[PDB]
Amino acid sequence: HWGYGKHNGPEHWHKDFPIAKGERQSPVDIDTHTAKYDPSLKPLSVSYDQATSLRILNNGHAFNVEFDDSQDKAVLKGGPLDGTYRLIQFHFHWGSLDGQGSEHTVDKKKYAAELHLVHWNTKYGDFGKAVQQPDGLAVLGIFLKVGSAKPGLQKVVDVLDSIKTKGKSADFTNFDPRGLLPESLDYWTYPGSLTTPPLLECVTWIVLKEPISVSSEQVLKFRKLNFNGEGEPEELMVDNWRPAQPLKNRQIKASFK
Ligand SMILES: CC(=O)Nc1nnc(S(N)(=O)=O)s1
Ligand SMILES: [Zn+2]
């Protein structure tokens, strides 16, 4: 019964998922002055030309856009990664106000939302096996700030009305995720976890330095979604973000000076 409420929120998760108090939990605050520039880090290789989106679903916590990951169609390579990682889904995290919504923070600064592009290491055969490994997933995090509209995001925004409640899904084909990327691919990277239960510590996080801009109207439509299922009391899907966790024995590395 976990969620983002006062009676089932992040502060409570540890009761069902003890790893919540683990050594490599996410998200975290990225202190730009203590981050270490690593010249050995290679540029990111994002190959989304052949991406095949299939649907969009409201899972009661966020909305996910799912892709066909039965072959190497949309993959992430390079950067701090060893091997090929396939894109399986993307989702966002957002707030009830423009001043909050992101999971990671930069020098304590919070963004309006955060986009997560989830990929799994193909050496493990399937997603379920990948999450059990320390190098099983790679999540690309992109911050969203409110300003000018993002044309490439409008297609997602327009279909939200069709998946307002938990459990609803809609066909969502031919969506090109390349339209959601910023101009630069400079990033920070650190070993972490999933930010929602089971909170497994199987993620190599890659957080882009350059945020993308979205309009107030676009983010407002995110806030119209529901955590609840149809026929149940309406609870607006807002503030579905986990606060920063202690860095502990970890070092954040930057690909840029
Ligand atoms: C099936 C799946 O993708 N689960 C995830 N759980 N948490 C994720 S996150 N918030 O770290 O990107 S992805
Ligand atoms: Zn996420």
From Swiss-Prot:
The active site is at 61 (proton donor/acceptor). Pfam families: Carb_anhydrase. Changing residue 15 to E: In Jogjakarta. Changing residue 116 to E: Strongly reduced activity. Zinc. Can also use cobalt(II) with lower efficiency, but not copper(II), nickel(II) and manganese(II). InterPro entries: CA_dom, CA_dom_sf, Carbonic_anhydrase_a-class, Carbonic_anhydrase_a-class_CS. Optimum pH is 6-8. Changing residue 4 to H: Reduced proton transfer rate. It comes from the Eukaryota. Changing residue 195 to A/C/H/P: Strongly reduced activity. SMART domains: Carb_anhydrase. Changing residue 103 to A/Q: Strongly reduced CO(2) hydrase activity. Residues 1-256 form the Alpha-carbonic anhydrase domain. Changing residue 61 to A: Reduced CO(2) hydrase activity, rescued by 4-methylimidazole (4-MI). Reduced proton transfer. Enhanced proton transfer. Enhanced proton transfer capacity. Catalyzes the reversible hydration of carbon dioxide. Can also hydrate cyanamide to urea. Stimulates the chloride-bicarbonate exchange activity of SLC26A6. Essential for bone resorption and osteoclast differentiation. Involved in the regulation of fluid secretion into the anterior chamber of the eye. Contributes to intracellular pH regulation in the duodenal upper villous epithelium during proton-coupled peptide absorption. It is linked to Osteopetrosis, autosomal recessive 3: A rare genetic disease characterized by abnormally dense bone, due to defective resorption of immature bone. Osteopetrosis occurs in two forms: a severe autosomal recessive form occurring in utero, infancy, or childhood, and a benign autosomal dominant form occurring in adolescence or adulthood. Recessive osteopetrosis commonly manifests in early infancy with macrocephaly, feeding difficulties, evolving blindness and deafness, bone marrow failure, severe anemia, and hepatosplenomegaly. This is Carbonic anhydrase 2. It comes from Homo sapiens (Human). The gene is CA2.
